[PDB]
Design a protein around this ligand. Structure first.
Ligand SMILES: [Mg+2]
Ligand SMILES: [Mg+2]
Ligand SMILES: [Mg+2]
Ligand SMILES: [Mg+2]
Ligand SMILES: [Mg+2]
Ligand SMILES: [Mg+2]
Ligand SMILES: [Mg+2]
Ligand SMILES: [Mg+2]
Ligand SMILES: [Mg+2]
Ligand SMILES: [Mg+2]
Ligand SMILES: [Mg+2]
Ligand SMILES: [Mg+2]
Ligand SMILES: [Mg+2]
Ligand SMILES: [Mg+2]
Ligand SMILES: [Mg+2]
Ligand SMILES: [Mg+2]
Ligand SMILES: [Mg+2]
Ligand SMILES: [Mg+2]
Ligand SMILES: [Mg+2]
Ligand SMILES: [Mg+2]
Ligand SMILES: [Mg+2]
Ligand SMILES: [Mg+2]
Ligand SMILES: [Mg+2]
Ligand SMILES: [Mg+2]
Ligand SMILES: [Mg+2]
Ligand SMILES: [Mg+2]
Ligand SMILES: [Mg+2]
Ligand SMILES: [Mg+2]
Ligand SMILES: [Mg+2]
Ligand SMILES: [Mg+2]
Ligand SMILES: [Mg+2]
Ligand SMILES: [Mg+2]
Ligand SMILES: [Mg+2]
Ligand SMILES: [Mg+2]
Ligand SMILES: [Mg+2]
Ligand SMILES: [Mg+2]
Ligand SMILES: [Mg+2]
Ligand SMILES: [Mg+2]
Ligand SMILES: [Mg+2]
Ligand SMILES: [Mg+2]
Ligand SMILES: [Mg+2]
Ligand SMILES: [Mg+2]
Ligand SMILES: [Mg+2]
Ligand SMILES: [Mg+2]
Ligand SMILES: [Mg+2]
Ligand SMILES: [Mg+2]
Ligand SMILES: [Mg+2]
Ligand SMILES: [Mg+2]
Ligand SMILES: [Mg+2]
Ligand SMILES: [Mg+2]
Ligand SMILES: [Mg+2]
Ligand SMILES: [Mg+2]
Ligand SMILES: [Mg+2]
Ligand SMILES: [Mg+2]
Ligand SMILES: [Mg+2]
Ligand SMILES: [Mg+2]
Ligand SMILES: [Mg+2]
Ligand SMILES: [Mg+2]
Ligand SMILES: [Mg+2]
Ligand SMILES: [Mg+2]
Ligand SMILES: [Mg+2]
Ligand SMILES: [Mg+2]
Ligand SMILES: [Mg+2]
Ligand SMILES: [Mg+2]
Ligand SMILES: [Mg+2]
Ligand SMILES: [Mg+2]
Ligand SMILES: [Mg+2]
Ligand SMILES: [Mg+2]
Ligand SMILES: [Mg+2]
Ligand SMILES: [Mg+2]
Ligand SMILES: [Mg+2]
Ligand SMILES: [Mg+2]
Ligand SMILES: [Mg+2]
Ligand SMILES: [Mg+2]
Ligand SMILES: [Mg+2]
Ligand SMILES: [Mg+2]
Ligand SMILES: [Mg+2]
Ligand SMILES: [Mg+2]
Ligand SMILES: [Mg+2]
Ligand SMILES: [Mg+2]
Ligand SMILES: [Mg+2]
Ligand SMILES: [Mg+2]
Ligand SMILES: [Mg+2]
Ligand SMILES: [Mg+2]
Ligand SMILES: [Mg+2]
Ligand SMILES: [Mg+2]
Ligand SMILES: [Mg+2]
Ligand SMILES: [Mg+2]
Ligand SMILES: [Mg+2]
Ligand SMILES: [Mg+2]
Ligand SMILES: [Mg+2]
Ligand SMILES: [Mg+2]
Ligand SMILES: [Mg+2]
Ligand SMILES: [Mg+2]
Ligand SMILES: [Mg+2]
Ligand SMILES: [Mg+2]
Ligand SMILES: [Mg+2]
Ligand SMILES: [Mg+2]
Ligand SMILES: [Zn+2]
Lengths: 122, 218, 37, 141
RNA sequence: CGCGGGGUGGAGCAGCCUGGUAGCUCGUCGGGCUCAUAACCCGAAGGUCGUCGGUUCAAAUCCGGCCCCCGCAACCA
RNA sequence: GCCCGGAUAGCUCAGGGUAGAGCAGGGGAUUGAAAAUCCCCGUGUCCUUGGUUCGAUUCCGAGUCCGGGCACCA
RNA sequence: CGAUCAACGGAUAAAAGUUACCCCGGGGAUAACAGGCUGAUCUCCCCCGAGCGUCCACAGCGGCGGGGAGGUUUGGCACCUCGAUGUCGGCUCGUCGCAUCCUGGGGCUGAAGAAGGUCCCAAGGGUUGGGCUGUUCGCCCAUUAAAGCGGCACGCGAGCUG
RNA sequence: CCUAAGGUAGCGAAAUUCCUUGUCGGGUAAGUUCCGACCUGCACGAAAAGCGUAACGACCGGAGCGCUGUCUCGGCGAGGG
């Protein structure tokens, strides 16, 4: 449940450590972004000599959220952070490792590359 | 003697002492089917290729082979695409270098706000250069940073401008609180602004952004 | 269609007719099709 | 465009626009003419636009007679200015044309050329007009 | 736009209250001094007075139009 | 667009009986050779196109443009 | 005989300013807001067809000139309101016009397709979130089918802000 | 040419800069505000003091962190009406 202003942890080795959401890429006036949605975001913190650097404007898919998502089996899942993986226009990760669990919803929404890179799909 | 105006139309020798600018030409052979020929020739005309030769390989009946000497630069983007499109695909092409040759070519300079932008100096054939200059002047108009003063954009074939565009002229609505009624109070603010734009026009060095170069040079 | 106040022959193959009060031009060249308005 | 070379007075009162034209009602120099059907102050810029239009039409051949002259100065207050403080400044000259007046005449030109040049020229003036052809009635005048 | 001032050799200024007369400094040009340049000395040219009109026997001058330049003003909303 | 004008040599320019000068050059004079100075010499398709004239840079058109006025122009 | 008593029927022989610290009597006889009348200016639409558009005046354009409409601009006028009709901008709540931003239907195209351009019909609904600035505007960022323009006392302070 | 004499140091788009959101640089995804600079100071300038200055300020700007019903966007609940 991400909206502009919200800070996300970046769960990949692109070099970004924190990004802030500047727009959720879903329709023309969507209020919120959940797991498997795409955001435009500003890189707020990065490690040196990374691939992305502070000030860059990037795309990213939400990979975990702190607000639980409700599943059609009747269950729900909740994570400790709101986190994202930086991706390109082809929805491909720009890094080569993803860190931490990710949500199973990423598979249907078309982020298979990210889903395999993950250490756990919940 | 001779040498080559290299990767810099700006870095010419002094067109004071000059007598021959040389294009690269090329021996260009076109295997069309039938009388797409009619289309083909119109294409090679505006590409300024001299028609040297044509020969029918008869049998049925279409097949014609056309030989052309054409400026090398006049292919390179555009041509192959248009060869293919006016001929529903059946036209072929091959070539080899075939040397150099004199061309009636002009140096077209591009100045923004009176200053010559070397980065945009090019070189064209006097049949076309106006239409070339009539184009860049206007695309540069749409991407230059609108200033506090109106910015002229110009193209000159050596010391004579041939194509002109103008950028605004961002201004302040100096009359915004003027519901008095007295025209003298609008004039007072209008005079001062007119005087200031003169001053900012005279000493106003505009720089072209690297984002504009990429926009004109696509 | 060309919708104008002054509709007129454009080429000699053009033909001028009256239609629903407005003056019309019809012609074998569709560019010349005009109704008044 | 025409204006008097010198004037006794710079500003003059508007006057009325009554009556048929006083003179200049018969074709006097050419073969065809354009005559006014309504009164008006025809401005110099208008006259110039009518002249040029017919000129353009006679690119090789033809004589154009301009038989109206803008001698009446036209006055206008500066914009956004209250009433008073004297009469406006001269901003142009007009010619007073009453109905029946011959304003332009063409000669040395085929009938078709003449009635087309005068038709365009009419389209440049603020008044309805009628194209006319030198008559025995002009000769008798 | 309103008020006031102004426009004169190439530059910067007198002259015009005041009609008849155009001056000062520098610059320019010809000559000298010096080996030479400047400084300096001698000699000369260059103004029809922004421009059109009027008044007058006569206009830089006086009066009006037009052009341009400078200063001041444009307030209560 | 508009009023005033203004497009004349590579450049900055003077101007109804085919137009020049500075300047850049190239060459030459001066010098031991240069700089400076000076001499000599061009292609002007008198901006482009059309017409006007016996004769057009000039005049009539049109086209593109340049410097000042108005006007659009947070 | 002393008058530029020239504010020239000539108030004293003798006279300038300032008030945002202000006060009273009056005036909608008279300005500023809004309304009205007008429509120069403004916006929009036409007429003419000179010139573009390799070719072709009218796919798209439209010199010089000409005719109108609107009543959103700046004004002109001074008609009700000065024993008071509270201002800009925002927020809130809208509703209306259509000269249509998107979406629906068309005609033309310099419309192969797709995507455009342009004009015709069309007002049912829709017409984002931010940075700057009091701002309305506008510029920028990120999007979007689109990020329309105007009227309603430049809608709306006995509804709020200030 | 004119003046009594022609504004020095320092400072400068400023509590001053009109034109003006001047230009350049910083900060922001985006900065008419802000900070640094430039100097074209309409109209800074030396006890109506000039340029600075540690500390101090319920003074007025600009930025970030923290934290929040200020807001997305409103819900519920309590008591006095
Ligand atoms: Mg945060
Ligand atoms: Mg992680
Ligand atoms: Mg940084
Ligand atoms: Mg008002
Ligand atoms: Mg027509
Ligand atoms: Mg038919
Ligand atoms: Mg009139
Ligand atoms: Mg009048
Ligand atoms: Mg009056
Ligand atoms: Mg008047
Ligand atoms: Mg008419
Ligand atoms: Mg002088
Ligand atoms: Mg005297
Ligand atoms: Mg001498
Ligand atoms: Mg010697
Ligand atoms: Mg005079
Ligand atoms: Mg006399
Ligand atoms: Mg005289
Ligand atoms: Mg005299
Ligand atoms: Mg005289
Ligand atoms: Mg006052
Ligand atoms: Mg006021
Ligand atoms: Mg703005
Ligand atoms: Mg008295
Ligand atoms: Mg009196
Ligand atoms: Mg009296
Ligand atoms: Mg009396
Ligand atoms: Mg007395
Ligand atoms: Mg008093
Ligand atoms: Mg006062
Ligand atoms: Mg006070
Ligand atoms: Mg008090
Ligand atoms: Mg006090
Ligand atoms: Mg009192
Ligand atoms: Mg009353
Ligand atoms: Mg009244
Ligand atoms: Mg009264
Ligand atoms: Mg009101
Ligand atoms: Mg009322
Ligand atoms: Mg109207
Ligand atoms: Mg009306
Ligand atoms: Mg209409
Ligand atoms: Mg054409
Ligand atoms: Mg056509
Ligand atoms: Mg109204
Ligand atoms: Mg009004
Ligand atoms: Mg009113
Ligand atoms: Mg009355
Ligand atoms: Mg009142
Ligand atoms: Mg009262
Ligand atoms: Mg009452
Ligand atoms: Mg706001
Ligand atoms: Mg509304
Ligand atoms: Mg409609
Ligand atoms: Mg439309
Ligand atoms: Mg539609
Ligand atoms: Mg296509
Ligand atoms: Mg299609
Ligand atoms: Mg479309
Ligand atoms: Mg269509
Ligand atoms: Mg609708
Ligand atoms: Mg709507
Ligand atoms: Mg703010
Ligand atoms: Mg769409
Ligand atoms: Mg917005
Ligand atoms: Mg209003
Ligand atoms: Mg209101
Ligand atoms: Mg209130
Ligand atoms: Mg309010
Ligand atoms: Mg009320
Ligand atoms: Mg306040
Ligand atoms: Mg308060
Ligand atoms: Mg001294
Ligand atoms: Mg000072
Ligand atoms: Mg100093
Ligand atoms: Mg400064
Ligand atoms: Mg600043
Ligand atoms: Mg100041
Ligand atoms: Mg700025
Ligand atoms: Mg910056
Ligand atoms: Mg940055
Ligand atoms: Mg930056
Ligand atoms: Mg930036
Ligand atoms: Mg800035
Ligand atoms: Mg600043
Ligand atoms: Mg600062
Ligand atoms: Mg001070
Ligand atoms: Mg002082
Ligand atoms: Mg002192
Ligand atoms: Mg002090
Ligand atoms: Mg200080
Ligand atoms: Mg110290
Ligand atoms: Mg301090
Ligand atoms: Mg304090
Ligand atoms: Mg901020
Ligand atoms: Mg709340
Ligand atoms: Mg409650
Ligand atoms: Mg309760
Ligand atoms: Zn037809």
């Amino acid at each position: 449940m991400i909206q502009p202003q919200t800070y996300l942890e970046v769960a990949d080795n692109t070099g970004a450590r924190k990004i802030m959401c500047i727009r959720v890429l879903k329709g023309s006036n969507a209020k919120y972004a959940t797991v498997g949605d795409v955001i435009v975001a500003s890189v707020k913190e990065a490690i040196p000599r990374g691939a992305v650097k502070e000030g860059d404007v990037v795309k990213a898919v939400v990979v975990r959220t702190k607000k639980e998502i409700k599943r059609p089996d009747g269950s729900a899942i909740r994570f400790d952070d709101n986190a994202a993986v930086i991706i390109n226009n082809q929805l491909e990760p720009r890094g080569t490792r993803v860190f931490g669990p990710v949500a199973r919803e990423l598979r249907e929404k078309g982020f298979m590359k990210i889903v395999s890179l993950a250490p756990e799909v919940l | 003697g001779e040498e080559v105006e290299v990767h810099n139309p700006a870095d010419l020798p002094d067109p004071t002492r000059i007598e021959e600018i040389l294009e690269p030409y090329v021996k260009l052979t076109i295997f069309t089917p039938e009388e797409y020929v009619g289309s083909l020739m119109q294409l090679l005309q505006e590409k300024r290729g001299r028609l040297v030769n044509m020969n029918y390989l008869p049998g049925a009946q279409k097949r014609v082979e056309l030989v052309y000497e054409a400026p090398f630069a006049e292919i390179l983007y555009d041509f192959h695409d248009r060869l293919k499109s006016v001929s529903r695909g059946y036209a072929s092409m091959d070539y080899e270098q075939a040397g150099y040759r004199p061309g009636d070519l002009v140096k077209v300079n591009v100045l923004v706000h009176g200053e010559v932008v070397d980065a945009l100096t090019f070189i064209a054939h006097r049949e076309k250069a106006y239409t070339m200059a009539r184009a860049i002047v206007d695309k540069l108009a749409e991407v230059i940073p609108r200033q506090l003063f109106e910015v002229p954009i110009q193209a000159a074939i050596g010391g004579k401008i041939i194509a002109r565009a103008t950028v605004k002229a961002l201004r302040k609505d100096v009359l915004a609180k003027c519901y008095g009624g007295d025209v003298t109070r609008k004039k007072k603010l209008l005079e001062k602004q007119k005087e200031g734009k003169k001053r900012l026009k005279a000493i106003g060095k505009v720089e072209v952004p690297q984002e504009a170069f990429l926009a004109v040079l696509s | 269609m060309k919708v104008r106040a002054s509709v007129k022959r454009i080429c000699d193959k053009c033909k001028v007719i009256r239609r629903h009060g407005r003056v019309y031009v019809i012609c074998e060249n569709p560019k010349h099709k005009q109704r008044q308005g | 465009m025409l204006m008097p070379r010198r004037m006794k007075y710079r500003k003059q009162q508007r006057g009325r626009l009554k009556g048929a034209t006083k003179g200049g009602d018969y074709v006097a120099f050419g073969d065809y003419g354009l005559v006014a059907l309504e009164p008006a102050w025809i401005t110099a810029q208008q006259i110039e636009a009518a002249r040029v239009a017919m000129v353009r039409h006679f690119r090789r051949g033809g004589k154009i007679f301009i038989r109206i002259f803008p001698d009446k100065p036209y006055t206008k207050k500066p914009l956004e200015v209250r009433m008073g403080k004297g009469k406006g400044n001269v901003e142009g000259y007009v010619a007073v044309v009453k109905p029946g007046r011959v304003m332009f005449e063409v000669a040395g030109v085929t009938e078709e050329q003449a009635m087309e040049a005068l038709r365009i020229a009419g389209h440049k003036l603020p008044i309805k007009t009628k194209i006319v052809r030198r008559d025995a009635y002009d000769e008798a005048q």
